[PDB]
Amino acid sequence: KLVFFA
Amino acid sequence: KLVFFA
Amino acid sequence: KLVFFA
Amino acid sequence: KLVFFA
Amino acid sequence: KLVFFA
Amino acid sequence: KLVFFA
Amino acid sequence: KLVFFA
Amino acid sequence: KLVFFA
Amino acid sequence: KLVFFA
Amino acid sequence: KLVFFA
Amino acid sequence: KLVFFA
Amino acid sequence: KLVFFA
């Protein structure tokens, strides 16, 4: 899995 | 920006 | 699955 | 913008 | 910026 | 796993 | 499966 | 933009 | 699986 | 930007 | 697994 | 930036 927040 | 995948 | 929010 | 797929 | 993966 | 925060 | 958006 | 391929 | 975003 | 390949 | 971001 | 390879 991958979680990205910008 | 929010991105999630699995 | 994929969730994207911009 | 909101995109979801699976 | 926050990134997490596994 | 990997956790990154900037 | 191929998804592209912009 | 986003490009996804599975 | 290939994911790209910007 | 982000590039992911699994 | 290959992940790149900036 | 970040480059990860496993």
The residue to which tokens 């596994």 are assigned: E6
User: In this structure, are residues K4 and A2 in contact, taking their beta carbons and an 8 Å threshold?
Assistant: no
Asked if B3 lies within 8 A of C4 by C-beta distance, the reply is yes
Experimental resolution (Å): 1.8
Please, do chains H and I touch (3+ CB pairs < 8 Å)? Answer: yes
Quote the longest CA-to-CA distance of chain C. Answer: 17
What's the one-letter identity of residue C3?
V
User: In this structure, are residues J2 and K5 in contact, taking their beta carbons and an 8 Å threshold?
Assistant: yes
User: How many angstroms separate the CA of residue K2 from the nearest CA in chain J?
Assistant: 5
User: In this structure, are residues I1 and G2 in contact, taking their beta carbons and an 8 Å threshold?
Assistant: no
Q: What experimental approach yielded this model? A: X-ray
CA distance B3 to B5: 7
What's the one-letter identity of residue K3?
V
3 state DSSP class of G6: coil
Q: Which residue of B has its CA nearest to C2?
A: B5
